[PDB]
């Protein structure tokens, strides 16, 4: 089972998700951080185990528009996994 | 085994995302999802035998969330297809 951890603080910003036990999941996490280096100026703050285990992206610019739409968007579509897999589990902090 | 059609008109929007035939599809599909659920845009969108075909024609190719929707599961495909080149990407 993939475990996703997904941190939204008092301002509605998503500040931190960390992916961990992860092919659709990690299409659309990877992806999703591809898009925000290369399409928005926001640069996450990007960590992981050895084992490339606990993928924990922490927003830096919170009042990114841009990189907040793209990270709900990411959201949206790995709740599209869950409500058909439910292989994966969504943990709102 | 999957082909990807992404048409861009000239004024840099895009207009029509095609897929015949996992990663793929939660990508595609997800991304509808978010266009419907976080936009005022509603494609127009064309789906056969249960996925074989999926095509997502923009509407209002001027709304720019829906845009960076598209563009962000265009770079997510491109994704897929660098480590699987199973997918192919054709800018129309």
């Given at each position: 089972?993939?475990?996703?951890?997904?941190?939204?603080?008092?301002?509605?910003?998503?500040?931190?998700?960390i992916?961990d036990?992860?092919?659709?999941?990690?299409?659309?996490?990877?992806?999703?951080?591809?898009?925000?280096?290369?399409?928005?100026?926001?640069?996450?703050?990007?960590n992981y185990d050895?084992?490339?285990g606990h993928f924990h992206?922490?927003?830096?610019?919170?009042?990114?528009?841009?990189?907040?739409?793209?990270?709900?968007?990411?959201?949206?579509?790995?709740?599209?996994?869950?409500?058909?897999?439910?292989?994966?589990?969504?943990?709102?902090?």
């Amino acid at each position: 089972m993939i475990t996703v951890d997904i941190t939204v603080n008092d301002e509605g910003k998503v500040t931190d998700v960390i992916m961990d036990g992860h092919a659709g999941a990690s299409a659309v996490l990877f992806g999703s951080v591809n898009a925000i280096i290369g399409l928005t100026s926001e640069r996450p703050d990007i960590n992981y185990d050895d084992n490339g285990g606990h993928f924990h992206i922490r927003s830096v610019d919170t009042n990114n528009d841009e990189a907040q739409l793209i990270l709900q968007t990411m959201l949206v579509s790995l709740q599209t996994i869950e409500e058909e897999y439910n292989n994966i589990r969504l943990n709102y902090k």
